[PDB]
Structure 1
Amino acid sequence: NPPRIKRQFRDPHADWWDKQERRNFGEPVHEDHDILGMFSPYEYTWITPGKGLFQIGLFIASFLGLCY
């Protein structure tokens, strides 16, 4: 298996046999190809999961403080 990365992390300015999915014709494919291409759940990368949950708790605490 190749290292499994969402194909969205490929660059859109590479020699692509298919530009839409950013794949060369005969590139080795991960067994999860069906859920690793462009048409797939977007992987947001603004923050990491641990830090993001901390920020939401701040708003809930602020919301709770407003109610009190």
Structure 2
Amino acid sequence: KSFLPHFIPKNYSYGDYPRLKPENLQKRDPYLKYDDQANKRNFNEPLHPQQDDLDMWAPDHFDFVQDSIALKWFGTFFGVLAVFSSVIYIGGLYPEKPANPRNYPFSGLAKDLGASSEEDTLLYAAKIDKSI
């Protein structure tokens, strides 16, 4: 149902500091009165050693499903969009070009595209119109 965030130790040992089960304060019932209503905290409540990871200011913890299920659903989705892409590519179902792609005179506008001399024609030329 409701599970703790990751990287939360199940035990710790810090001398005489009180040892308590980590409570993610984001999940507290918001219809109860608190001394700190915004933070859902009463005065003098002991803090976990990593309470900054288990309070309102920590990143929100989404727990509708487990992370693996969400990661499995996430991969399942984009896997379909890759199978759809791969079926068409290998089978070659995309249409062919209806016309020869555009070509241009003047050796494919080589001079207009920053070509210096005949040695650098195909370096800068667009597709060449062989039909004068």
Give the TM-score, by structure 1 length. Answer: 0.84
CA distance in structure 2 between the aligned counterparts of 1:66 and 1:51, rounded to whole angstroms? 23
Which is worse superposed, 14-23 or 32-41?
32-41
Structure 1 residue 60 corresponds to structure 2 residue 78: yes
CA RMSD of aligned residues (A): 1.3
Q: CA deviation at 1:56?
A: 1.6
- Matching residue of 2:47: 29
Q: CA deviation at 1:64?
A: 0.9
Cα deviations by residue, 1:20-55 (Å, 9 ceiling, x for unpaired) = 100110112111122221011110012102211211
Where does 1:7-22 land on structure 2 (aligned, <5 Å)?
Answer: 7-22=25-40
CA distance in structure 1 between the aligned counterparts of 2:52 and 2:73, rounded to whole angstroms? 33
CA distance in structure 2 between the aligned counterparts of 1:34 and 1:62, rounded to whole angstroms? 39
Q: Which amino acid aligns with 1:38?
A: M
Give the TM-score, by structure 2 length. Answer: 0.47
Which runs of 5 or more structure 2 residues have no equivalent in the other structure? Answer: 1-18, 87-132
CA distance in structure 2 between the aligned counterparts of 1:20 and 1:10, rounded to whole angstroms? 11
CA distance in structure 1 between the aligned counterparts of 2:53 and 2:73, rounded to whole angstroms? 29
Higher relative contact order (CA 8 A, sep 6+): 1
Structure 1 or 2, whichever has the larger Rg, is 2
